[PDB]
Amino acid sequence: SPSLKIAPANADFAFRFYYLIASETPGKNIFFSPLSISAAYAMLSLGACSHSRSQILEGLGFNLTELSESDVHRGFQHLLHTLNLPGHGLETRVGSALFLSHNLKFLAKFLNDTMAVYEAKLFHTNFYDTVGTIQLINDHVKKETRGKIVDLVSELKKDVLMVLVNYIYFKALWEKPFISSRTTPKDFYVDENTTVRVPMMLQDQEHHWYLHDRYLPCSVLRMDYKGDATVFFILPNQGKMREIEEVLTPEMLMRWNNLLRKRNFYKKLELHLPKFSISGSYVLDQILPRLGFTDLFSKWADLSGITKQQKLEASKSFHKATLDVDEAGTEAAQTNRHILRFNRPFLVVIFSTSTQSVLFLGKVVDPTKP
Numbered sequence: 265s266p267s268l269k270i271a272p273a274n275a276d277f278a279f280r281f282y283y284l285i286a287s288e289t290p291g292k293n294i295f296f297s298p299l300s301i302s303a304a305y306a307m308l309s310l311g312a313c314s315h316s317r318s319q320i321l322e323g324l325g326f327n328l329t330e331l332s333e334s335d336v337h338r339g340f341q342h343l344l345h346t347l348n349l350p351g352h353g354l355e356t357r358v359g360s361a362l363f364l365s366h367n368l369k370f371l372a373k374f375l376n377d378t379m380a381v382y383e384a385k386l387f388h389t390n391f392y393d394t395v396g397t398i399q400l401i402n403d404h405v406k407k408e409t410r411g412k413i414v415d416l417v418s419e420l421k422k423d424v425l426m427v428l429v430n431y432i433y434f435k436a437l438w439e440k441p442f443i444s445s446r447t448t449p450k451d452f453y454v455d456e457n458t459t460v461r462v463p464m465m466l467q468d469q470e471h472h473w474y475l476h477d478r479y480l481p482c483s484v485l486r487m488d489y490k491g492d493a494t495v496f497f498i499l500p501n502q503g504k505m506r507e508i509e510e511v512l513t514p515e516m517l518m519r520w521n522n523l524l525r526k527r528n529f530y531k532k533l534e535l536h537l538p539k540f541s542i543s544g545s546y547v548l549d550q551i552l553p554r555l556g557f558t559d560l561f562s563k564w565a566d567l568s569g570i571t572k573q574q575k576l577e578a579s580k581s582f583h584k585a586t587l588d589v590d591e592a593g594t595e596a597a598q599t600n601r602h603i604l605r606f607n608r609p610f611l612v613v614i615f616s617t618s619t620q621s622v623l624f625l626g627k628v629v630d631p632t633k634p
């Protein structure tokens with residue numbers, strides 16, 4: 265398979281991006297889509313030339329002696345094609361867009377290659393009209409995510425001459441949904457200092473795929489969507505968040521996935537899981553240098569495949585993604601001796617089974633925060 269060749273690299277980047285955001289901002293909500301970030305910078309590398317192209321692909325976790333550049337783009341084409349398939353009420357549409365300054369011509373080679381493989385959306389704007397470009401960029405991302413991601417870019421300089429945005433429209437239905445009449449406000453303990461009131465869903469009729477980890481200090485719940493998608497909710501033991509984050513590798517995800525396919529762990533459960541929405545918005549041009557993209561955001565960057573007329577330094581890149589846990593899914597005679605209350609911080613890993621890739625990755629510290 266082409267898409268199976270790029271999956272190890274993309275998984276590596278996901279948890280590398282997580283560990284950085286978790287380290288630099290410890291007590292805060294995290295939520296992003298490694299795949300939309302990977303796909304967009306893989307798309308952007310079609311415009312980079314010689315050395316600066318290698319640094320992008322190597323930053324994304326690819327081994328350029330193992331894989332060719334052709335293997336990466338064919339990998340992403342077969343990955344995106346699989347995720348765009350009709351689905352069982354399941355939508356995972358990865359997308360990206362570049363807004364280049366007017367008075368800079370896109371090269372035809374770039375326009376063709378980006379659109380033919382990644383279906384990227386390329387635009388001209390006048391960055392001196394700062395209120396205009398922000399309106400133009402945000403409405404495009406709003407239109408493409410169908411309202412779900414709004415106000416992506418809050419501010420921009422006038423010297424800026426290119427902005428990259430990446431997003432993912434996500435709609436999914438639970439295999440086993442919750443009944444909304446049984447959902448009531450209950451306590452959520454963010455830490456030993458403070459407590460918050462959140463709507464808490466309840467389900468004690470179904471069996472679930474869940475385990476209590478022998479080796480690590482956490483419980484892992486696996487809740488399927490309808491279609492080829494799944495959510496891993498990892499609930500660490502009290503005070504042991506950063507201990508689980510310390511070991512949150514791609515090898516660890518595949519351990520929990522393989523363990524939760526065994527019928528041994530398919531047992532009855534009184535599940536209490538909150539009904540909430542969090543968002544994570546990330547200024548990628550400031551974050552990605554620390555993951556080994558220092559060349560792309562500098563004077564020595566070579567993006568002459570995008571345009572020859574000017575040097576393309578001082579370029580911004582933004583990404584936003586929202587987690588929606590609802591009774592249905594994302595949109596708005598049973599006795600249990602086993603329970604799981606998600607009433608303190610937990611990790612979230614939305615995982616595509618058809619493409620073996622992490623669609624979303626994040627942490628829920630306070631579910632109420634606007």
Ligand SMILES: *[C@@H]1O[C@H](CO[C@H]2O[C@@H](C)[C@@H](O)[C@@H](O)[C@@H]2O)[C@@H](O[C@@H]2O[C@H](CO)[C@@H](O[C@@H]3O[C@H](CO)[C@@H](O)[C@H](O)[C@@H]3O)[C@H](O)[C@H]2NC(C)=O)[C@H](O)[C@H]1NC(C)=O
Nearest residue numbers: 269272273276321322324325326327328329330331332335
């Ligand atoms: C990045 O990739 C390279 C290349 O990996 C692939 O190369 C293609 C062509 C194909 O052969 C495929 O099967 C390979 O996976 C990795 O480089 C290789 O590293 C291993 C060490 O783990 C080397 O094997 C060793 O060979 C020496 C004798 O030369 C022995 O002493 C050892 O016992 C062992 O067998 C191998 O020579 C390297 N291959 C090449 C083509 O140079 C590289 O490890 C990988 N980076 C990673 C995983 O971080």
Ligand SMILES: *[C@@H]1O[C@H](CO[C@H]2O[C@@H](C)[C@@H](O)[C@@H](O)[C@@H]2O)[C@@H](O[C@@H]2O[C@H](CO)[C@@H](O[C@@H]3O[C@H](CO)[C@@H](O)[C@H](O)[C@@H]3O)[C@H](O)[C@H]2NC(C)=O)[C@H](O)[C@H]1NC(C)=O
Nearest residue numbers: 310333334335337338341372373375376377378379380381
């Ligand atoms: C617009 O781009 C598409 C896809 O571009 C990707 O594929 C190549 C070019 C590579 O550089 C990669 O990095 C790009 O992202 C082009 O579609 C491809 O067209 C070629 C031939 O026109 C096909 O490859 C092979 O061509 C040789 C002869 O040169 C034949 O012997 C082979 O049988 C085979 O046809 C390839 O299948 C196409 N790829 C896809 C994904 O459809 C397209 O040509 C380009 N258009 C323009 C005007 O530049």
